[PDB]
Amino acid sequence: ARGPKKHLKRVAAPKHWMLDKLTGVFAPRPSTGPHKLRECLPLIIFLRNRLKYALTGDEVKKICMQRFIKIDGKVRTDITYPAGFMDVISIDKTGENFRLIYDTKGRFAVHRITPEEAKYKLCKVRKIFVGTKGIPHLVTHDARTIRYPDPLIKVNDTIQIDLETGKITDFIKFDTGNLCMVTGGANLGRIGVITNRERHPGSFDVVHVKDANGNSFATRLSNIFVIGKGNKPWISLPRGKGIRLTIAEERDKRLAAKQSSG
Amino acid sequence: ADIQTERAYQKQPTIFQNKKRVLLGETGKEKLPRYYKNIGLGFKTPKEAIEGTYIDKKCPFTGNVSIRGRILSGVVTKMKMQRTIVIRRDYLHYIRKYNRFEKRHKNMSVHLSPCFRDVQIGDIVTVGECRPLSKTVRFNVLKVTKAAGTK
Amino acid sequence: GISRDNWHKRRKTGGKRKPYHKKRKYELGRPAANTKIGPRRIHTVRVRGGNKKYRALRLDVGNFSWGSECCTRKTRIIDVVYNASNNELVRTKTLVKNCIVLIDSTPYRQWYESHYALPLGRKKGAKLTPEEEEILNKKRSKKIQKKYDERKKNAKISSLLEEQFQQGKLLACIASRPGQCGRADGYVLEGKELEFYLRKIKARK
RNA sequence: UCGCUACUACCGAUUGGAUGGUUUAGUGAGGCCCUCGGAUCGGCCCCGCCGGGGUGCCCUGGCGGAGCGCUGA
RNA sequence: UUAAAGUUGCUGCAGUUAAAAAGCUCGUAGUUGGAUCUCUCUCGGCCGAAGCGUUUACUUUGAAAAAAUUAGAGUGUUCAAAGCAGGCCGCCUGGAUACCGCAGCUAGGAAUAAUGGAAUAGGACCGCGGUUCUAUUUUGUUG
RNA sequence: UACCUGGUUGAUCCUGCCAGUAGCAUAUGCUUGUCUCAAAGAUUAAGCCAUGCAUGUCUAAGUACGCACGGCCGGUACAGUGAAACUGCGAAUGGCUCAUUAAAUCAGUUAUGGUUCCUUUGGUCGCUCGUACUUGGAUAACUGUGGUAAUUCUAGAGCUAAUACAUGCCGACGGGCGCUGACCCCCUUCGCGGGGGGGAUGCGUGCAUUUAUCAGUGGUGACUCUAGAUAACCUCGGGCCGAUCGCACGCCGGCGGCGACGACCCAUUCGAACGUCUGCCCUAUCAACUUUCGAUGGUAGUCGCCGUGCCUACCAUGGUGACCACGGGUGACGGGGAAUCAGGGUUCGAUUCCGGAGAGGGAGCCUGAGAAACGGCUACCACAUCCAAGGAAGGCAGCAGGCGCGCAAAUU
C-alpha cells in the first residue's frame, strides 16, 4: 500500500459488532477519533443494527443530518463516528440517554440511563506531563487533554468529567479494594474488586480481581478500569451486573424461564 | 596518551572539562568528573566504570545507549575484533513426528565494555537488547559470570 | 537515485542476497553540501513529512561560545585547519561538524575588557586610544569600583589562550552540522583539548 | 557365434546453430544537484509637457525620452 | 493425489539361505551413559511490600493469542445443505462455548535428567583491632 | 467399520511386486424432468490487444457583470436559480494477477528511551513592550484576431475577481523581569573606611531554530526525559503571532451571539518504517565461503525522517561453516486453511480473509502528508498506431469482448 486504507471488509470487522455474513461485502470503517478502530461502536451500527430506528444506511444519514444525536453533549453528523467505552448518547427528540457499557459476553449493551446520569462520565488517566511554563497536563482514554489537575491524580486512576464544562469533579485512585471493569482481553465485561497487583518491571503488570460470587481472575494492568471506590460503582450497571455465568448455569436459567411462561 | 589514541579528542559529552575555577584547583589535582548512569533492571554498575577513564559511547553504564527489549544469556566463544565479542547460544528444537529433539546453535555478536575486564572465552554472559550499534550488533553485555573452572 | 538501503549488501555469513522489491522513496540519499567559506548562500530542501532543511553552501559568520567565560558571540570564520575525519577536507576548505577552524577574537576581547576592566590582547608597544581608555580607565563611583576590584582577583586566562589573542584569531570547533541546519555554531577550544589539537596541527607540518 | 526386423541411451571430427543469463574495457540518453549565464518583465532614480495641496522646495497624476545608475524576478 | 502400504516402519519393517553386516581395528564430531544425599532479614495496619533457593529441562496453572472454516449450544429454512435468526398477546430473547503445535511471558510441584557449591583452604559463622576514601545529621542561620 | 482379494507351483509354505478396492481434484464421453445454493482463462503465454465503460466533486457559509432563465424596483454595489472558469480536496483507497522472492517474504512475540504522520478528537491560538473603517500587481472564464493534415495542441490582443499570489499595521501596552548604572539617603568609626538601601540613562525579553553553560516541578526499571535558569543565534530558497465567509439581530458612537474556513505547536486516532527471539521444500556428482570493487569491527564525519558500513577517510584482521555454511534447483508468493485418516502420518494451499510484490523489461523523477505512482511524466530496450513524410500519440496481470496458446474456463 502507498498510503492509509479507507475500507473495511465484513469478516475483518470486530466480532462484537455482530455483523452477519450475507448483508454485504463491506463494513463501516470507523472514522479517526477518540477511540480505537477495534474497540469502538460506530453510530450507524448503533442507530440501525441495535436500536432499529433505521432500516438502511441512508436512513441513518437522514437522522444524523437533522442534528438529533449528541455524543457527550455535542452534535455529531458523521455516521461512522467512533463512539466507545463510557460515552453518553442523547436523543432529545425521543428523550433517550444511553451509556456504552460492556456486557458479560464482551459486547456493548443497550444501557439506558436517566437525564441526570448523562451529565458526567468516568475517564481513565493515560498520560501526565508538564508543559511550557510548568503547567501540568493530563491525557485520558477519551483523548481529552485537561490542564491544571490535582497533583494527587496519577496514571491508571479514574476521574469524573462534567460533560458541559469538561472539568474534573472527583477522582478515584488505583488501589486494592476498589471496584473495576475489564475493558479488554478474555475477561472483557467483567466487574470485580482488585485484590492484588504483581509488578514485572520492563514488561506488563498483572492485576487480580475477585467477583461478588467469589470467582477470581487476572488481567493485564492496561485492561483495568476503576469504576467505584470499594464495592459501590460510580455508574449504573447493566443487567448482568458483571457476573459471568457458566454455560450450564445459563442453560438452567434459560430453561427455568419457559416453564414460568404459561 | 593512552586515553587519546584516536584522531579526535575523546570525552564524555555530558562532562565539561574547562571550568576555570582557581589557581589552587590547577595545583590540587586534575581528575575529571565522570558521567555514569544506572542501567537498571536489578543489574548493578561495575565499579570499574565509576573509577575508570576509558571513553566509549556504546557502553551501557558510561555511554549513550538504552537497554530495552530482551534479556538473554550465552557463552563467550571468540574475543578477536576490537571491543566486541562473539558468543554462542545452544538450544533444543522439537521435531514432533519423532517426538524428539535436536541440538541447534546461534552465534551472536555483542559489544564488550572496558568496565568488564579479566574475561576469558569460557564464561556465561548476560546480554541486554539495545538499538542497532553496527550492521550485526544489537545486544550489549550486562553481567559476566565465570565458567566452571572458577579460580 | 542514491539509495541508503540494507539489501544491496552481503549477509553476515558473506552470502549474496536477492532483492524482492525495487528502490523506494523512504530510502533515498542526496548529494553532499560541501560548505565552503564565503558570503552566505543557503538553499531550502523539502523533506519527508513536508518539512524543510537548510543546505548551507557558503558560510562567513557563525555563533561561537567561549565556554569558560560563558560568552557566546557572532564571529567571522577565517580559515580551515586540521580535520579529524579527512585531511582532504582542509585543502578544499570545507566546513563540516567537528572541524577545527579559525575565528576572530574582537567580540570576545571587548567583553573581557569591558567586564574585568583589564587590557587583554594589547601588544607591548603602548597602544592607547581615547575610546579604549574611556572603556578601561573611566572613573566610577566608590561602590562600582569596589565591585570591579573584588572581581579582578579571578580575572586570569591561560597562557595558550592569551597567545592567540596576540594574533587576533582563536581556534574553534564547530559543533553544528552546517549542511543540515544551515549554520555553523560551536565552541572555542581550551584546556587539554586545545593541547591535543595544537600537537596534531604541528604534526602535519 | 553368425544372419535377418524395430526402438532407446551414449561417444563423436564439424572449435555446429538457435534461445537466454553473467561479466573486462570503452561509449553513454534522461532526470537530479552544484557553478555560471542572462532572452525578457517591473520598481526606485534623471530630464521634457504639464494640474492640486502644503510651503524657490516637497507629496502627488497621465505619461514620453534616455543614461555601461541600482536593485528585484 | 490419500487410504489400502506394518511395500519408508517414531508408533512399526527387514539384513544365515529370499534384496541386504563395511576385510579388520583405531579414532574426532554426533548419539548414549552404573550405586549414592529426608525460605527469610527491614518497613505499612497476627499479614502484605523486598531479597533469592545454583541454573535449567519437565509438569500443572494463568493471560495473550482477527474473523471466516472445523468441533459444538440454541433455533420446525415446510425437511435438509444453509442462515443467524426469532418468540408472546407493544413486550420477551439470542447472536454461546471448546480447540488455536513451536517459540516468548506468568505462578505452584520437585520424582526423573543435566549443573554448581570447602582439599596450595584465597572455607563458613562470630565477635575484635588497624590503612584509605567517604555520610553531610549536630553547634537558632551563614563561614 | 483398527477389513483385504486375484496372479510364480505337478501340488505346498513364504518373500515380493503387479492388478483389483474406496475417496478426492482437473479434463472428457454418454444421458438429463422439478427445485435451493453455487465455482468459473490459475496451470500454458506476468503472451498481444479493436471498441465502449471503470474517478470525480458545492453547501446558508472561497470567487457570479454568461439576460441562460420566469420575474422583483426601478438612483438601490450584490434580489434568486445557475452553465463556464479560478480556488480547495480526492485521484497513494478499491479491482486484478502470482512473474520475482529460500532467514528473503511471512507467522507468533517484542521495541521505538531511534522516526514520520494529511485527517478526526482535545489543548493552545491580547504570553512578544517593538490604510487598519481594508493595502498591491496580475490572470482565467468572456469578447475579438489566428496557426497546423493531425491531439484533452495552443499564440497574440481587450477586460475583470479571490480563503489564488503578495504586502503590512493598530490594540492588549500600563508595565514586569534581568544586566549597565552617573547621582542621592541611612547605621557605625574621630576620620579614612565598612555595611545596608534608592535610583535617572541605556541594552535584552514570547513560543518554535541553532550552539554553549548551570541547578535540582513531574515521571520511568532505566534519560543525555519533561519543566527551569543563563550568554547568544535565528537562514530573503524567510517561522507562529487571522486584511477570509454565512445566519440572526440587538443592548447602552461604542459593545456583542451562533457557526464555517484557515494556524506554528502539543497530545490522540489511522497507520507506515526500521529493528528483537523462534520457525521453511530438494540437493555434497555443491566443503569450504566472504575480503582488490565493505567483507567483521573501531574513531570522526556525509547523507538520510531517524538507528545503523547507509556512504567516505584513517585504522584493526576479522565474520560464517558437518548442529550443513557457500552454491544450485523448485510445476516455490507466505499464512488462516483443504483432501485423506483407528492412533501416528501423507499430500495440497494461483484462488474472494491478513501480509508481500508487480503493472511489457530496466532506470529516473515531479506533485503531494503519503508514490520511485504507471487509467502521472522523462529517457533507453521490444512491440505497435495515424500521417499531406514535416510531425503526433502508446500500455486490459480493471469490467465486458477479441486473437493466440492449449486437455482445460461464461454477457462487448
One DSSP character per residue, B134-145 reads SSSEEEEEEEEE
Beta pairing partners, C66 = C71
| Of C200, C190, C197, nearest in space to C67 by CA | C190
Cell of A243: 457476573
| Of B80, B71, B53, nearest in space to B140 by CA | B71
Q: Is A128 helix (H, G, I), strand (E, B) or coil?
A: strand
On the 0-12 / 13-18 / 19+ scale of CB atoms within 10 A, A182 is: buried
Beta pairing partners, B94 = B101
The label of the residue with cell 581556534 reads C171
Q: What are phi and psi of B59, to 5 degrees?
A: -75, 140
Residue A159 included in any domain: yes
The label of the residue with cell 555511554 reads B63
Q: Is C197 on the interface with B (CB under 8 A)?
A: yes
User: Which positions in chain B touch C7 (Cβ < 8 Å)?
Assistant: none
| Of A224, A102, A97, A223, nearest in space to A163 by CA | A97
Q: Is B18 on the interface with C (CB under 8 A)?
A: yes
Q: For C86, how many CA atoms within 13 A lie in the half-sphere containing its CB?
A: 9
Chains in contact with C via at least 3 Cβ–Cβ pairs below 8 Å: B
- Nearest-angstrom CA–CA distance, A209 and A244: 13
Residues 6+ positions from C71 with CB-CB distance below 8 Å? C65, C108, C111, C112
Cell of B47: 565499579
On the 0-12 / 13-18 / 19+ scale of CB atoms within 10 A, C141 is: exposed
The label of the residue with cell 470507523 reads A30
A98 shares its domain with A7: yes
- Nearest-angstrom CA–CA distance, B138 and B69: 10
Around Cβ B146, how many Cβ atoms within 10 Å?
Answer: 13
Q: How many domains does chain B have?
A: 1
Taking a C-beta distance cutoff of 8 angstroms, is the pair A91, A68 a contact?
yes
Contact C156 B23 (CB under 8 A): yes
| Of B114, B108, B118, nearest in space to B86 by CA | B108
| Of C75, C80, C77, C34, nearest in space to C57 by CA | C34
Kindly calculate the radius of gyration of chain C based on its CA atoms and give it in whole angstroms. 24
- Nearest-angstrom CA–CA distance, C198 and A238: 80
- Nearest-angstrom CA–CA distance, C174 and C199: 19
- Nearest-angstrom CA–CA distance, A9 and A19: 11
Q: Is the CB of A20 under 7 A from strand E?
A: yes
Q: How far is B135 from chain C (nearest CA, A)?
A: 8
Taking a C-beta distance cutoff of 8 angstroms, is the pair A121, A168 a contact?
no
- The integer distance in angstroms from the CA atom of A25 to the C1' atom of F401 is 27
Instruction: Return the beta strands (E) in C115-158 as ranges.
Output: none
Q: For A219, how many CA atoms within 13 A lie in the half-sphere containing its CB?
A: 24
- Nearest-angstrom CA–CA distance, A190 and A213: 12
- The integer distance in angstroms from the CA atom of A63 to the C1' atom of F78 is 36
- Nearest-angstrom CA–CA distance, A113 and A237: 10
- Nearest-angstrom CA–CA distance, B10 and B25: 22
- Nearest-angstrom CA–CA distance, B39 and B127: 12
- Nearest-angstrom CA–CA distance, B91 and B104: 5
Q: Is the CB of A53 under 7 A from strand E?
A: no
Q: Which amino acid is at B36?
A: Y
- Nearest-angstrom CA–CA distance, A50 and A18: 10
Q: How far is B47 from chain A (nearest CA, A)?
A: 24
Contact B9 C197 (CB under 8 A): yes
Q: Is C79 on the interface with B (CB under 8 A)?
A: no
Distances in Å between the alpha carbon of C97 and those of B27, C89, C93?
34, 12, 13
- Nearest-angstrom CA–CA distance, A126 and C114: 54
* Phi-psi category of residue B37: left, alpha or beta, with phi > 0 → left and psi -120 to 50 → alpha: beta
Range(s) of the domain holding residue B36: 1-151
Residue A257 included in any domain: no
Q: Which of C156, C191, C196 sits opposite B18 (nearest CB)?
A: C191
Q: Is C114 helix (H, G, I), strand (E, B) or coil?
A: helix
Q: Is C163 helix (H, G, I), strand (E, B) or coil?
A: helix
Q: Is C196 on the interface with B (CB under 8 A)?
A: yes
Distances in Å between the alpha carbon of B145 and those of B122, B124, B126, C205?
10, 5, 8, 50
Q: Is B70 on the interface with C (CB under 8 A)?
A: no
* Cα-based torsion angle of the residue sequence A193, A195, A200, A205 in order, rounded to the nearest 10 degrees: 0
Q: How many domains does chain A have?
A: 3
A1 shares its domain with A112: yes
Residues 6+ positions from C140 with CB-CB distance below 8 Å? C148
Distances in Å between the alpha carbon of A54 and those of A64, A91, A221, B40, C115?
11, 14, 39, 58, 81
Around Cβ A54, how many Cβ atoms within 10 Å?
Answer: 18
- Nearest-angstrom CA–CA distance, C79 and C91: 11
Q: How far is A203 from chain B (nearest CA, A)?
A: 9
Around Cβ A204, how many Cβ atoms within 10 Å?
Answer: 10
Taking a C-beta distance cutoff of 8 angstroms, is the pair B3, B11 a contact?
no
DSSP state of A234: S
Q: Is C159 on the interface with B (CB under 8 A)?
A: no
- Nearest-angstrom CA–CA distance, C60 and C93: 12
Q: For A197, how many CA atoms within 13 A lie in the half-sphere containing its CB?
A: 16
Q: Is C94 helix (H, G, I), strand (E, B) or coil?
A: coil
Tell how far CA C56 is from the center of its chain.
15
- Nearest-angstrom CA–CA distance, B16 and B7: 20
Alpha-carbon torsion B42, B48, B50, B56, what sign?
A: negative
Cell of C45: 530542501
Cell of A151: 497533583
- Determination technique for this entry: cryo-EM
- Nearest-angstrom CA–CA distance, A5 and A26: 13
- Nearest-angstrom CA–CA distance, B89 and A201: 25
User: Which positions in chain C touch B7 (Cβ < 8 Å)?
Assistant: 84-85, 200
Q: Which amino acid is at C34?
A: N
- Nearest-angstrom CA–CA distance, C102 and C75: 10
Strand order in the sheet with C36-37: C36-37, C51-59, C41-47
Residues in chain C: 205
| Nearest-CA residue relative to C1' of F127 | A133
- Nearest-angstrom CA–CA distance, A144 and A163: 11
Tell how far CA C7 is from the center of its chain.
38
Range(s) of the domain holding residue A215: 174-244
On the 0-12 / 13-18 / 19+ scale of CB atoms within 10 A, C8 is: exposed
A131 shares its domain with A79: no
Cell of C42: 543557503
User: Considering all CA atoms of chain B, what is the largest pairwise distance in Å, rounded to the nearest integer?
Assistant: 80
User: Which positions in chain B touch C12 (Cβ < 8 Å)?
Assistant: 135-136
| Of A148, A28, A144, nearest in space to A86 by CA | A144
- Nearest-angstrom CA–CA distance, A64 and A77: 5
| DSSP string of A155-174, one letter each residue | TT-EEEEETTTTEEEEEE--
* Phi-psi category of residue B58: left, alpha or beta, with phi > 0 → left and psi -120 to 50 → alpha: alpha
A→B contacts (Cβ < 8 Å), by residue, are 201-202
Beta pairing partners, C56 = C42
Q: What are phi and psi of C48, to 5 degrees?
A: -50, 140
Beta pairing partners, A208 = A196, A218
- Nearest-angstrom CA–CA distance, B36 and B65: 12
DSSP state of B63: S
Q: Give the residue from A116, A137, A152 where a domain finishes.
A: A116
- Nearest-angstrom CA–CA distance, A235 and A118: 10
Cell of A182: 475489564
Beta pairing partners, A180 = A192, A226
DSSP state of A16: G
Q: Least CA distance to B70: which residue of chain A?
A: A202
| Of C121, C79, C117, C114, nearest in space to C100 by CA | C79
Cell of A134: 510548568
Helix (H) or strand (E) holding B125: strand B124-129
- Nearest-angstrom CA–CA distance, B146 and C84: 40
User: Considering all CA atoms of chain C, what is the largest pairwise distance in Å, rounded to the nearest integer?
Assistant: 83
Q: Is C66 helix (H, G, I), strand (E, B) or coil?
A: strand
Kindly calculate the radius of gyration of chain B based on its CA atoms and give it in whole angstroms. 20
Q: Is the CB of C14 under 7 A from strand D?
A: no
Taking a C-beta distance cutoff of 8 angstroms, is the pair B91, B105 a contact?
yes
The nucleotide minimizing the C1' distance to residue C31's CA is D33
- The integer distance in angstroms from the CA atom of C16 to the C1' atom of F106 is 21
- Nearest-angstrom CA–CA distance, A45 and A23: 13
The label of the residue with cell 544491496 reads C8
Taking a C-beta distance cutoff of 8 angstroms, is the pair A202, A191 a contact?
no
A83 shares its domain with A189: no
Name A residues 63-82 whose Cβ lies under 7 Å from strand E.
none
A138 shares its domain with A42: no
DSSP state of C154: G
- Nearest-angstrom CA–CA distance, A91 and A69: 5
What are the counts of helices (DSSP H) followed by strands (DSSP E) for chain C? 6, 8
Alpha-carbon torsion C104, C108, C114, C118, what sign?
A: negative
Angle among Cα C135, C141, C145 to the nearest 5 degrees reads 65
| Of C185, C187, C179, nearest in space to C41 by CA | C179
Around Cβ A226, how many Cβ atoms within 10 Å?
Answer: 22
Q: Is A79 helix (H, G, I), strand (E, B) or coil?
A: coil
A9 shares its domain with A43: yes
Cell of C199: 600537537
Cell of B145: 559470570
| Of B3, A244, B9, nearest in space to C98 by CA | B9
A67 shares its domain with A25: yes
